C-alpha cells in the first residue's frame, strides 16, 4: 500500500 522512499525520483 505504502510507497517506498524512492518510488519515483
Amino acid at each position, epitope marked *: 500500500l505504502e510507497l*517506498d*522512499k*524512492w518510488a519515483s*525520483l
Partner: antibody, heavy 132, light 108 residues
C-alpha cells in the same frame, strides 16, 4: 569498505524492552539518501523486515511491530538504535542491521536510483533469545 | 513486510547445474527487487539489486531478470557455496518484504 555490527543483550526476558545497537563504518548517516534498516530472522524461518531510518531522519516501521519499535540514529557516533518494547518468546531471532544505498548522484544530482533497490551490506547479526 | 512468493520453496541440485528461482509479487514492484544468498550461519549476501543489476564482487554466474510481479534469479553453473537459501526482497512498498526463501541443497 562498509561494515555494520549489531550489539545488544543476547538474552532478554518477556515484557522487557530490547535495545539493539548497530555500529557502522564506511559510510555516514549524513550521506545523501543512505538508509540503515533492521531485519530479523527467527531460527529456521524467513527474513523479516523491521524498520529503516534514513539520513534525513525519515523513518519507517514494520506495520505489525510499529507500536513496539522505535528506531533512532546517532549520526556522530555512527550508530543506529532499534528499541523493541514488550518482547515475547516469538521475538527470539537473529537481528541484522543492514545498509541501504542512497541514489547515485553526480555533481550533487541524483542520476540513478537503481542502487537503492537492495540492502547491500549486512551485519553479522546478533542472536537474541527471549525467555524468562 | 509485504507479500512475495518464491518458487520453488525447495530445490535439489548438483554442482555445475543451472538453476532458477522465481519470485512473484502480489502487486507490481517495478524493478525494486533484490536477491540474496544466505549460507548456513551467515548473514544474507546481496547478489542482484534492482532486479537485474549484479552487485559488484558477486560472481557472474548469478543473474536476475523480470519486472512488475515476476522475477527470476538464475545461477548458470551451481558452485558448492551456492547450496544455500535464497531470498528475494521487494523495496517498492513499505514495509519492504522478503520472500519465504528458497532452500537449495545437494541432490541425491
Amino acid at each position: 569498505r562498509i561494515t555494520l555490527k549489531e550489539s545488544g543483550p543476547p538474552l532478554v526476558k518477556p515484557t522487557q524492552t530490547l535495545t539493539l545497537t548497530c555500529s557502522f563504518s564506511g559510510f555516514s548517516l549524513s550521506d545523501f539518501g543512505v538508509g540503515v534498516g533492521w531485519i530479523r530472522q527467527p531460527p529456521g524461518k524467513a527474513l523479516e523486515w523491521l524498520a529503516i531510518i534514513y539520513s534525513d531522519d525519515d523513518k519507517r516501521y514494520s506495520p505489525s511491530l510499529n507500536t513496539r519499535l522505535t528506531i533512532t540514529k546517532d549520526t556522530s557516533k555512527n550508530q543506529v538504535v532499534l528499541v523493541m518494547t514488550r518482547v515475547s518468546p516469538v521475538d527470539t531471532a537473529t537481528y541484522f542491521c543492514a545498509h541501504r544505498r542512497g541514489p547515485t548522484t553526480l555533481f550533487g544530482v541524483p542520476i540513478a536510483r537503481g542502487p537503492v533497490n537492495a540492502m547491500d551490506v549486512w551485519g553479522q547479526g546478533i542472536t537474541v533469545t527471549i525467555s524468562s | 513486510a509485504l507479500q512475495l512468493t518464491q518458487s520453488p520453496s525447495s530445490l535439489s541440485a548438483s554442482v555445475g547445474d543451472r538453476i532458477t528461482i522465481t519470485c512473484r509479487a502480489s502487486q507490481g514492484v517495478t524493478s525494486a527487487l533484490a536477491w540474496y544468498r544466505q549460507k548456513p550461519g551467515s548473514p544474507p549476501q546481496l547478489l542482484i539489486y534492482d532486479a537485474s543489476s549484479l552487485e559488484s564482487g558477486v560472481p557472474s554466474r548469478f543473474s536476475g531478470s523480470g519486472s512488475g510481479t515476476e522475477f527470476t534469479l538464475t545461477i548458470s553453473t551451481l558452485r558448492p557455496e551456492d547450496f544455500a537459501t535464497y531470498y528475494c526482497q521487494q523495496l517498492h512498498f513499505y514495509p519492504h518484504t522478503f520472500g519465504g526463501g528458497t532452500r537449495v541443497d545437494v541432490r541425491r
